[PDB]
Amino acid sequence: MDADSLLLSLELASGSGQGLSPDRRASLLTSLMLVKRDYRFARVLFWGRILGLVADYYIAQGLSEDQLAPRKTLYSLNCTEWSLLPPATEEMAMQISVVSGRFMGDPSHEYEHVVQIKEETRLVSIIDQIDKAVAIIPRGALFKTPFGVTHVNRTFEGLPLSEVRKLSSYFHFREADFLDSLEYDIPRGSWSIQMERGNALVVLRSLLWPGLTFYHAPRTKNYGYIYVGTGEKNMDLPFML
C-alpha cells in the first residue's frame, strides 16, 4: 500500500476485515512520509501488520529508484518509532525453519531449537518469504526496459473486467510482459478472486499466507497489497481446495 494513499486504500473497508485504526493510520501517514524524508526512498509503502501475541508489528517498505530488487523493509511497535531491518538472505531463511508459531511482540525475544533464533531474524525472514510469490503487480503496471526494469507505467488504466477473473492478468513482485504470473505451477486454486463493492473492486486473497489482501479498482490506477494476519505460512492449502 502506497504511503500517501492508505486513507485512499482502506483494506478494512475493502473486505479484508482487519486493518488500521484511525490512530494507527494517522501515525502511519505522517511517519511513512517522514520515512521517505530520512532514508531517501523514491517511494514508501506500508507493508502490513503481523499480529503476534503481545504486541503488533507494523511493517513498512521503502523503494529506491524504480526496480524490484532494492526493497528495504521496516518495523515499528508504536508506528512512529521506525527502525531499519537488516537485509534478508538464504541463511536466515533456512535458519527460521526450526521455529514455528505466532510472533511475540518483542524483537529481542529469542527462541530455542540449541540454535538461538532471534525474533528479529524471524521477522525479516517471514517478511521475505511472504513477499516472494504473493505480492501482486497487476498486468500493465510494470514492464522491462531493455536497460533495466524501471518503467513504472504512468499511463496505466487498470485491468478491463474481462481480464480480471482470469488470474493471468496479475504478476508477482519477484525478480522475474516479463514477470511470472500468479499461474506459475503453484498449488492450483491458491488465489481467491472476489468482485467486491458493486464490481468496483477486485479483492485477491493469498491462501498460502492468510491475511494477505491485494486489490485494485478496475479501469483505474489504484492498486496495492497488504498483510494483516498471523505471519505463518499456510502450507495447509491443498488439504482444503
Binding site: 482502506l10 473486505g15 486493518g19
Partner: protein, 49 residues
C-alpha cells in the same frame, strides 16, 4: 429489534477491525430487512466468514 451495529463498528474501527462504514451500514440495513421479514427478538451481526 436490532443492535446499534454502527456503534459497534465504530469501536471496531477504534480497534482496527470491521468491514468499514459503507459495508457495515449495508449489513445493518440487511439485518433490518431480516427483522422486518421474521418475528425475531434478536438480530446480531455475528460475523463475516
Amino acid at each position: 429489534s436490532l443492535p446499534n451495529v454502527m456503534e459497534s463498528a465504530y469501536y471496531f474501527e477504534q480497534a482496527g477491525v470491521g468491514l468499514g462504514t459503507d459495508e457495515t451500514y449495508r449489513v445493518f440495513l440487511a439485518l433490518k430487512q431480516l427483522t422486518d421479514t421474521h418475528p425475531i427478538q434478536r438480530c446480531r451481526f455475528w460475523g463475516k466468514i
